[PDB]
Protein backbone atom coordinates (compact mmCIF):
# COMPACT_ATOMS: atom_id res chain seq x y z
CA UNK A 1 0.00 0.00 0.00
CA UNK A 2 0.90 3.66 0.40
CA UNK A 3 1.44 5.83 3.46
CA UNK A 4 -1.90 6.68 5.06
CA UNK A 5 -2.96 10.22 5.94
CA UNK A 6 -2.57 9.61 9.68
CA UNK A 7 1.11 8.83 9.13
CA UNK A 8 1.82 11.79 6.85
CA UNK A 9 0.97 14.36 9.53
CA UNK A 10 4.10 13.58 11.55
CA UNK A 11 6.35 14.85 8.77
CA UNK A 12 4.78 18.26 9.39
CA UNK A 13 5.02 19.34 5.76
CA UNK A 14 1.52 20.59 4.91
CA UNK A 15 0.22 19.66 8.38
CA UNK A 16 2.12 22.29 10.37
CA UNK A 17 -0.03 24.66 12.39
CA UNK A 18 -1.11 28.00 10.92
CA UNK A 19 0.50 30.57 13.22
CA UNK A 20 1.31 33.57 11.01
CA UNK A 21 -1.15 35.95 12.72
CA UNK A 22 -0.79 34.77 16.33
CA UNK A 23 0.01 37.27 19.07
CA UNK A 24 2.56 35.17 20.97
CA UNK A 25 2.58 32.50 23.67
CA UNK A 26 0.10 33.09 26.48
CA UNK A 27 1.63 32.33 29.87
CA UNK A 28 2.46 33.74 33.28
CA UNK A 29 5.49 35.90 33.89
CA UNK A 30 8.61 33.97 34.83
CA UNK A 31 8.64 33.14 38.53
CA UNK A 32 10.98 35.39 40.49
CA UNK A 33 11.66 36.72 43.98
CA UNK A 34 8.83 39.26 44.10
CA UNK A 35 6.20 36.69 43.17
CA UNK A 36 7.77 34.04 45.42
CA UNK A 37 7.62 36.27 48.51
CA UNK A 38 5.21 39.17 47.95
CA UNK A 39 3.00 40.62 45.23
CA UNK A 40 3.58 42.62 42.05
CA UNK A 41 0.96 44.86 40.44
CA UNK A 42 0.38 45.00 36.71
CA UNK A 43 -2.25 46.85 34.70
CA UNK A 44 -4.36 45.35 31.92
CA UNK A 45 -3.97 47.42 28.76
CA UNK A 46 -5.79 45.36 26.12
CA UNK A 47 -8.15 42.42 25.73
CA UNK A 48 -7.40 41.03 22.29
CA UNK A 49 -8.36 38.17 19.99
CA UNK A 50 -5.86 35.44 19.11
CA UNK A 51 -6.51 33.55 15.84
CA UNK A 52 -7.13 29.86 16.39
CA UNK A 53 -7.71 30.37 20.13
CA UNK A 54 -11.25 30.55 21.46
CA UNK A 55 -10.33 32.41 24.63
CA UNK A 56 -9.35 36.10 24.59
CA UNK A 57 -5.88 37.10 25.78
CA UNK A 58 -5.05 39.93 28.18
CA UNK A 59 -2.11 42.28 27.65
CA UNK A 60 -0.60 43.26 31.00
CA UNK A 61 2.22 45.69 31.80
CA UNK A 62 4.43 45.39 34.88
CA UNK A 63 7.40 47.37 36.11
CA UNK A 64 10.61 45.36 36.05
CA UNK A 65 11.72 44.36 39.58
CA UNK A 66 15.30 45.64 39.23
CA UNK A 67 15.74 47.16 35.75
CA UNK A 68 14.46 50.59 34.70
CA UNK A 69 12.24 49.07 32.02
CA UNK A 70 8.68 48.06 31.30
CA UNK A 71 7.67 44.39 31.43
CA UNK A 72 4.83 43.38 29.10
CA UNK A 73 3.04 40.07 29.62
CA UNK A 74 0.30 38.21 27.79
CA UNK A 75 -1.73 35.36 29.25
CA UNK A 76 -5.18 33.82 28.92
CA UNK A 77 -7.83 36.23 30.20
CA UNK A 78 -10.13 35.12 33.00
CA UNK A 79 -13.79 36.02 32.62
CA UNK A 80 -14.52 39.45 34.07
CA UNK A 81 -11.11 41.00 33.40
CA UNK A 82 -11.14 44.44 31.83
CA UNK A 83 -8.80 47.14 30.57
CA UNK A 84 -7.42 49.51 33.15
CA UNK A 85 -7.69 46.85 35.86
CA UNK A 86 -4.93 46.22 38.39
CA UNK A 87 -3.90 42.57 38.64
CA UNK A 88 -1.58 41.24 41.33
CA UNK A 89 0.74 38.25 41.09
CA UNK A 90 2.49 36.54 43.96
CA UNK A 91 2.30 34.85 47.35
CA UNK A 92 0.54 37.80 49.02
CA UNK A 93 -1.90 38.60 46.20
CA UNK A 94 -5.55 38.82 47.23
CA UNK A 95 -7.98 36.09 46.19
CA UNK A 96 -9.68 38.04 43.39
CA UNK A 97 -10.56 37.09 39.84
CA UNK A 98 -7.68 37.92 37.52
CA UNK A 99 -4.96 37.63 40.18
CA UNK A 100 -2.18 35.03 39.99
CA UNK A 101 -1.56 33.10 43.20
CA UNK A 102 0.28 30.03 44.44
CA UNK A 103 -2.05 27.12 45.12
CA UNK A 104 -1.10 27.24 48.81
CA UNK A 105 -2.96 30.57 48.98
CA UNK A 106 -6.21 29.32 47.36
CA UNK A 107 -8.62 27.62 49.81
CA UNK A 108 -10.61 24.47 49.13
CA UNK A 109 -13.20 24.87 46.37
CA UNK A 110 -11.55 27.74 44.52
CA UNK A 111 -11.98 28.09 40.77
CA UNK A 112 -8.64 28.48 38.99
CA UNK A 113 -7.27 28.48 35.46
CA UNK A 114 -3.88 28.29 33.74
CA UNK A 115 -2.53 26.04 36.48
CA UNK A 116 1.16 25.15 36.57
CA UNK A 117 2.23 21.51 36.70
CA UNK A 118 5.80 22.32 37.72
CA UNK A 119 6.81 25.35 39.75
CA UNK A 120 7.67 27.93 37.11
CA UNK A 121 5.78 26.20 34.29
CA UNK A 122 3.86 29.46 33.53
CA UNK A 123 0.56 27.58 33.22
CA UNK A 124 -0.30 24.19 31.74
CA UNK A 125 -3.83 23.28 32.86
CA UNK A 126 -7.31 24.63 32.08
CA UNK A 127 -6.43 27.11 29.36
CA UNK A 128 -9.21 26.66 26.77
CA UNK A 129 -12.21 28.98 26.74
CA UNK A 130 -14.72 28.40 29.52
CA UNK A 131 -12.55 25.83 31.32
CA UNK A 132 -11.28 25.84 34.90
CA UNK A 133 -9.85 23.67 37.65
CA UNK A 134 -11.21 23.19 41.17
CA UNK A 135 -9.09 23.07 44.32
CA UNK A 136 -10.11 19.91 46.18
CA UNK A 137 -7.79 19.53 49.17
CA UNK A 138 -4.42 20.53 50.61
CA UNK A 139 -1.63 18.39 52.07
CA UNK A 140 0.74 20.39 54.33
CA UNK A 141 3.07 17.44 55.03
CA UNK A 142 4.07 16.71 51.44
CA UNK A 143 3.30 20.31 50.43
CA UNK A 144 1.06 19.09 47.59
CA UNK A 145 -2.42 20.11 46.48
CA UNK A 146 -5.26 18.19 44.84
CA UNK A 147 -7.05 19.82 41.91
CA UNK A 148 -9.82 18.66 39.60
CA UNK A 149 -9.10 19.07 35.87
CA UNK A 150 -11.75 19.91 33.25
CA UNK A 151 -11.75 16.31 32.01
CA UNK A 152 -12.64 15.17 35.54
CA UNK A 153 -9.28 13.64 36.45
CA UNK A 154 -7.81 14.37 39.86
CA UNK A 155 -4.24 15.63 39.85
CA UNK A 156 -1.64 16.20 42.57
CA UNK A 157 0.35 19.40 42.10
CA UNK A 158 2.96 21.15 44.27
CA UNK A 159 1.42 23.83 46.46
CA UNK A 160 3.87 26.38 45.02
CA UNK A 161 2.36 26.09 41.54
CA UNK A 162 0.66 29.23 40.28
CA UNK A 163 -2.88 29.63 38.97
CA UNK A 164 -5.10 32.54 38.03
CA UNK A 165 -8.32 33.06 39.97
CA UNK A 166 -11.50 32.57 37.95
CA UNK A 167 -12.49 30.66 34.85
CA UNK A 168 -11.29 31.23 31.31
CA UNK A 169 -13.23 33.80 29.29
CA UNK A 170 -15.25 32.97 26.19
CA UNK A 171 -17.27 30.07 27.56
CA UNK A 172 -20.25 28.68 25.72
CA UNK A 173 -18.53 28.83 22.34
CA UNK A 174 -19.30 25.26 21.22
CA UNK A 175 -23.03 25.39 22.02
CA UNK A 176 -23.71 27.29 18.77
CA UNK A 177 -24.30 25.15 15.66
CA UNK A 178 -21.81 25.85 12.89
CA UNK A 179 -24.54 25.28 10.26
CA UNK A 180 -22.23 25.45 7.26
CA UNK A 181 -19.22 23.79 5.73
CA UNK A 182 -17.92 27.31 5.16
CA UNK A 183 -18.02 28.18 8.85
CA UNK A 184 -15.98 25.04 9.51
CA UNK A 185 -13.64 26.03 6.68
CA UNK A 186 -12.89 29.37 8.34
CA UNK A 187 -12.42 27.80 11.78
CA UNK A 188 -9.71 25.39 10.62
CA UNK A 189 -8.14 27.80 8.11
CA UNK A 190 -6.37 29.50 11.04
CA UNK A 191 -5.56 26.27 12.92
CA UNK A 192 -4.24 23.40 10.77
CA UNK A 193 -4.75 21.46 7.54
CA UNK A 194 -7.25 19.01 8.97
CA UNK A 195 -10.88 19.95 8.37
CA UNK A 196 -12.36 18.18 5.33
CA UNK A 197 -12.00 14.55 6.36
CA UNK A 198 -12.53 11.74 3.87
CA UNK A 199 -13.89 8.52 5.34
CA UNK A 200 -11.56 5.54 5.24
CA UNK A 201 -14.37 3.39 3.83
CA UNK A 202 -14.57 5.86 0.92
CA UNK A 203 -10.96 5.04 -0.04
CA UNK A 204 -9.17 2.32 -1.94
CA UNK A 205 -7.37 -0.44 0.01
CA UNK A 206 -3.98 0.97 -1.03
CA UNK A 207 -4.73 4.12 1.00
CA UNK A 208 -6.50 2.87 4.13
CA UNK A 209 -7.23 -0.32 6.08
CA UNK A 210 -10.95 0.49 5.70
CA UNK A 211 -10.69 0.93 1.94
CA UNK A 212 -12.04 -1.29 -0.79
CA UNK A 213 -14.96 -3.63 -1.12
CA UNK A 214 -18.03 -3.72 -3.31
CA UNK A 215 -19.87 -2.02 -0.45
CA UNK A 216 -18.55 0.68 1.87
CA UNK A 217 -17.85 -1.36 5.00
CA UNK A 218 -14.89 -1.84 7.30
CA UNK A 219 -14.98 -5.63 7.07
CA UNK A 220 -13.19 -6.17 10.40
CA UNK A 221 -13.49 -4.76 13.90
CA UNK A 222 -12.81 -1.04 14.07
CA UNK A 223 -11.29 -1.47 17.54
CA UNK A 224 -7.51 -1.77 17.25
CA UNK A 225 -4.71 -2.78 19.62
CA UNK A 226 -2.75 -0.14 21.49
CA UNK A 227 0.48 -1.64 20.11
CA UNK A 228 -0.48 -1.78 16.43
CA UNK A 229 2.11 -0.29 14.07
CA UNK A 230 1.47 3.11 12.48
CA UNK A 231 -0.51 2.61 9.31
CA UNK A 232 -2.44 -0.17 11.05
CA UNK A 233 -3.64 1.87 14.06
CA UNK A 234 -6.83 3.39 12.66
CA UNK A 235 -10.38 3.40 13.92
CA UNK A 236 -11.04 3.22 17.66
CA UNK A 237 -7.70 2.81 19.41
CA UNK A 238 -7.50 0.68 22.58
CA UNK A 239 -11.21 1.10 23.26
CA UNK A 240 -12.48 -0.38 26.53
CA UNK A 241 -16.06 -0.29 25.18
CA UNK A 242 -18.07 0.94 22.21
CA UNK A 243 -21.64 1.86 21.41
CA UNK A 244 -23.94 4.40 23.03
CA UNK A 245 -24.87 3.68 26.64
Amino acid sequence: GRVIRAQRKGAGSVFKSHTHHRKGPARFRSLDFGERNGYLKGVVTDVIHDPGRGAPLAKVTFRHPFRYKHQKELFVAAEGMYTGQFVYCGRRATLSVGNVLPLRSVPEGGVICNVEHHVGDRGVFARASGDYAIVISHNPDNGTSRIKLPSGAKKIVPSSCRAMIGQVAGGGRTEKPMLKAGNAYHKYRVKRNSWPKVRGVAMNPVEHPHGGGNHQHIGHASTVRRDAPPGQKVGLIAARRTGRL
Binding site: V47, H49, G54, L95, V111, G171, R173, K176, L179
Partner: protein, 89 residues
Protein backbone atom coordinates in the same frame (compact mmCIF):
# COMPACT_ATOMS: atom_id res chain seq x y z
CA UNK B 1 -44.62 42.01 11.04
CA UNK B 2 -42.53 40.71 8.10
CA UNK B 3 -42.39 37.34 9.87
CA UNK B 4 -44.41 35.40 12.45
CA UNK B 5 -41.66 33.38 14.16
CA UNK B 6 -38.32 33.48 12.28
CA UNK B 7 -37.03 36.85 13.45
CA UNK B 8 -33.28 37.33 13.09
CA UNK B 9 -33.01 33.75 11.78
CA UNK B 10 -34.94 34.53 8.58
CA UNK B 11 -31.61 35.42 6.95
CA UNK B 12 -30.99 31.66 6.64
CA UNK B 13 -34.01 31.05 4.41
CA UNK B 14 -35.28 27.48 4.27
CA UNK B 15 -31.86 25.93 4.97
CA UNK B 16 -30.33 23.85 7.80
CA UNK B 17 -33.52 22.57 9.46
CA UNK B 18 -36.06 24.20 11.74
CA UNK B 19 -34.55 22.83 14.96
CA UNK B 20 -31.07 24.11 14.14
CA UNK B 21 -32.40 27.56 13.26
CA UNK B 22 -34.33 27.64 16.53
CA UNK B 23 -31.14 26.54 18.31
CA UNK B 24 -28.99 29.30 16.82
CA UNK B 25 -31.67 31.96 17.37
CA UNK B 26 -30.94 32.66 21.04
CA UNK B 27 -27.20 33.03 20.48
CA UNK B 28 -27.69 35.13 17.34
CA UNK B 29 -29.93 37.48 19.33
CA UNK B 30 -27.76 37.56 22.45
CA UNK B 31 -24.46 38.10 20.63
CA UNK B 32 -25.91 41.08 18.74
CA UNK B 33 -27.57 42.64 21.81
CA UNK B 34 -26.48 45.78 23.64
CA UNK B 35 -25.41 45.27 27.24
CA UNK B 36 -25.27 47.54 30.27
CA UNK B 37 -21.86 49.03 31.09
CA UNK B 38 -21.32 48.93 34.85
CA UNK B 39 -18.44 51.40 34.54
CA UNK B 40 -20.33 54.24 32.81
CA UNK B 41 -23.98 53.23 33.22
CA UNK B 42 -24.98 53.02 29.55
CA UNK B 43 -26.30 50.22 27.33
CA UNK B 44 -23.35 50.52 24.97
CA UNK B 45 -21.43 47.24 25.35
CA UNK B 46 -21.07 45.38 22.06
CA UNK B 47 -19.29 42.18 21.14
CA UNK B 48 -16.00 42.82 19.34
CA UNK B 49 -14.99 39.16 19.10
CA UNK B 50 -15.87 35.92 20.84
CA UNK B 51 -15.30 36.65 24.53
CA UNK B 52 -14.53 40.37 24.00
CA UNK B 53 -17.05 43.04 24.98
CA UNK B 54 -16.31 46.71 24.44
CA UNK B 55 -18.29 49.76 25.51
CA UNK B 56 -18.81 52.31 22.76
CA UNK B 57 -18.65 55.51 24.80
CA UNK B 58 -16.43 54.98 27.85
CA UNK B 59 -14.11 52.66 25.91
CA UNK B 60 -13.83 49.89 28.50
CA UNK B 61 -13.13 46.43 27.08
CA UNK B 62 -14.09 43.38 29.11
CA UNK B 63 -13.48 39.64 28.82
CA UNK B 64 -16.78 37.78 28.93
CA UNK B 65 -18.74 34.94 27.39
CA UNK B 66 -18.69 33.76 23.80
CA UNK B 67 -22.18 34.97 22.84
CA UNK B 68 -23.32 36.81 25.99
CA UNK B 69 -21.49 39.38 28.09
CA UNK B 70 -21.85 37.54 31.42
CA UNK B 71 -22.18 33.78 31.48
CA UNK B 72 -24.21 32.12 34.22
CA UNK B 73 -21.18 30.35 35.70
CA UNK B 74 -19.27 33.64 35.72
CA UNK B 75 -21.71 35.01 38.29
CA UNK B 76 -21.52 31.76 40.27
CA UNK B 77 -17.72 31.76 40.16
CA UNK B 78 -17.55 35.37 41.35
CA UNK B 79 -19.81 34.57 44.31
CA UNK B 80 -17.73 31.50 45.22
CA UNK B 81 -14.51 33.50 44.95
CA UNK B 82 -16.01 36.32 47.01
CA UNK B 83 -17.24 33.98 49.75
CA UNK B 84 -13.87 32.21 49.87
CA UNK B 85 -12.10 35.58 50.10
CA UNK B 86 -14.22 36.78 53.03
CA UNK B 87 -14.17 33.46 54.91
CA UNK B 88 -10.40 33.35 54.34
CA UNK B 89 -10.19 36.41 56.58
Amino acid sequence: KRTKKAGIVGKYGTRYGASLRKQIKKMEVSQHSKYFCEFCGKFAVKRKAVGIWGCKDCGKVKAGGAYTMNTASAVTVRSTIRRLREQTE
